Amino acid sequence: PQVAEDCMGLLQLLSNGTVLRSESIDLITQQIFKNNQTVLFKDSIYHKPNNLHLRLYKPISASNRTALPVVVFFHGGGFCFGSRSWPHFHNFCLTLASSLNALVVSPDYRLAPEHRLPAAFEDAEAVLTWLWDQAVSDGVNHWFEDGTDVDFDRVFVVGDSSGGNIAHQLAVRFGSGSIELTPVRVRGYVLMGPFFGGEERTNSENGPSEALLSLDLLDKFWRLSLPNGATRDHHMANPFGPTSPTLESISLEPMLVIVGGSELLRDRAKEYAYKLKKMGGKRVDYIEFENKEHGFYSNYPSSEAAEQVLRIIGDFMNNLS
Ligand SMILES: *[C@@]1(=O)O[C]([O])[C]=C1[C]
C-alpha cells in the first residue's frame, strides 16, 4: 500500500523536533504561593554531518553560586521515537536542572528503523566527545550569552528507558578503558526503567500489560531497532547475552537502577542490578517504587513519586561528588 510509504514519513516528522534560534528561559515550580526558579536553555549542534542537536539547560540561581555538575540525559522512546524538544522530555530536563542544580545536556540520537542499533550508542559517544571538546576549548563560555562555570570532573549520565540502555553501553565503554575523555569524568550512571531485552521472558514480562507498555510493543521495538536477523539476546539488548562483555573484568562506575514495581521490565532490571552487585567492587543501588508502572517519574511530574526520584538522584550525585 502507498499509505505504508506514508506512515514511514509520519514517524520521521513526528520525532524530527525543532531547533531554537536563540537562548530561552522558563519558570519551573520548586518542591513545595508556589516557589519557582528560572532555567536557561538553548540548542546546539553536536554532530554536523548527521545534523544532530542537543539542548543545554542551566539553572540560573545555582549557576551564580558555584560550578555546576553536568547531567547528560538520554530520552526514551524505544530507540524509535523522541526528540529533545518534545515537551515531555523538555519538561523533565527543566525539572532535572532546577531540582539537581546541574547543567543538563539533552541530546537527540538517530532513531530506528531508519538508523538501527548501534547508531544510537554511536551518537551517545559523539555527545560525550562533544562535551570533551567543549571542556578543553573554553567552549562553555560561549554556550550562553553570559559566562558559565561547569565542573567537568562531576559528570553524571541519566538514561530513561532506551536511554537507560544507552547509559549502560557508555558505562561499559568507559569502565573497560576503551575510551577516556579527561578532564571529563563520569562519576555515575542512573538507569530509569532501562530498556533491556532477552529472548527468554521474565516473570514481569509475562505479567499483564501496563497502561501503555505491552510485551508485544517491547518486542516490536527490539525487532525494529536491532540489526536484521539478530535476536533479543544480542548484547545491544541483553547486557548478559552469550557475547555480552564479561562485566567482571571491566570496572563499572557506581550505578543506580530505578524501576516501577509494576513495570514489565522490573525483573530484567532487578536481575541486571543483582548480577552486578554479585560481581565484586560494584557499587550498584536498586530502587523499586511499588505499584508504579513505566516512566512514572516523567509521565507524572510534580507527583510524589517523581519528586522522590529527583531527590534520590541528587543524593546519589552528592554521595559521589
Ligand atoms: C524506552 O525508551 O524504552 C521503552 O521501550 C519505552 C521507552 C520510554
Describe the overall structure.
One of its GO terms (biological process) is regulation of secondary shoot formation. Keywords: Cytoplasm, Hydrolase, Nucleus, Serine esterase. (-)-2'-epi-GR24 binds at residues 77-78, 161-162. It comes from Arabidopsis thaliana (Mouse-ear cress). Its EC number is 3.1.1.-. With 321 residues, this protein is α/β, with parallel strands linked by helices. It has a single domain (4-319), classed as Rossmann fold (3-Layer(aba) Sandwich), CATH 3.40.50. 34% of the residues lie in helices and 21% in strands. The chain contains ten helices and nine strands. The protein has helices spanning 4-16, 60-63, 87-100, 119-136, 162-175, 203-206, 215-225, 266-277, 296-299, 304-319, and strands at residues 24-29, 36-47, 52-59, 68-74, 103-107, 150-160, 186-192, 255-260, 284-289. Strands 1-2-3-5-4-6-7-8-9 form a nine-stranded mixed sheet, with helices on both faces. Strand 2 and strand 3 form a beta hairpin. The longest helix is centred in the middle third of the chain and has 18 residues, at 119-136. The radius of gyration is 19 Å and the shape is globular. Bound molecules: (5S)-5-hydroxy-3-methylfuran-2(5H)-one. The site of (5S)-5-hydroxy-3-methylfuran-2(5H)-one has 9 residues, from helix 7.
